């Protein structure tokens, strides 16, 4: 299924995922399209952060959901 990943800069990125993919998979696709390393990416959906060991299905993310991508704070 497809899902929408909205960025801080107002851009909308389009992904093709499968329910069983883990959150680290999704950040990794964001990297091959935008170059943003996974360690710097935060996925927020409905006000709640998404965890790398969890799956898209564990958060009840369905077709055409809009996931919000927020960048991590400064760490040095």
Q: How many domains does the chain have?
A: 1
Q: What is d(CA 58, CA 35) in angstroms, rounded to the nearest whole number?
A: 26
Alpha carbons within 13 angstroms on the beta-carbon side of residue 53 total: 0
Q: Look at residue 12 and give its three-state secondary structure.
A: strand
Per the CB < 8 A criterion, the answer to whether 70 and 7 are in contact is no
Q: What is the DSSP string of 31-63?
A: HHHH---GGGEEEEETTEEPPTTSBTGGGT--T
Per the CB < 8 A criterion, the answer to whether 43 and 49 are in contact is yes
Of 23, 22, 70, 67, the C-alpha closest to 42 is: 70
Q: What is d(CA 23, CA 35) in angstroms, rounded to the nearest whole number?
A: 17
Q: What is the enclosing helix (H) or strand (E) of 30?
A: helix 23-34
Q: Identify the domain containing residue 67 by its residue range.
A: 1-76
């Amino acid at each position: 299924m497809q899902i929408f990943v909205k960025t801080l800069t107002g851009k909308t990125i389009t992904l093709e995922v499968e329910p069983s993919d883990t959150i680290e998979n999704v950040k990794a696709k964001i990297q091959d399209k935008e170059g943003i390393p996974p360690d710097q990416q935060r996925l927020i959906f409905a006000g709640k952060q998404l965890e790398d060991g969890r799956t898209l299905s564990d958060y009840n993310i369905q077709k055409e959901s809009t996931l919000h991508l927020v960048l991590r704070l400064r760490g040095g």
